[PDB]
Ligand SMILES: [Zn+2]
């Protein structure tokens with residue numbers, strides 16, 4: 807799970823997730839000009855403990 811915009815993982819709680827395929831810092835997408843609005847649930851993240859980690863490829 808290496809941010810295609812940074813390339814550095816940790817554990818704290820990266821986003822969106824890791825299972826998907828790639829990671830994107832909630833700030834990168836905004837710092838790059840990719841997304842421009844509420845493109846998620848912004849209700850909970852957690853890059854581990856079960857949860858509703860939604861993403862572009864997630865779907866779930
Ligand atoms: Zn990044």
Ligand SMILES: [Zn+2]
Nearest residue numbers: 823826861864
């Ligand atoms: Zn995902």
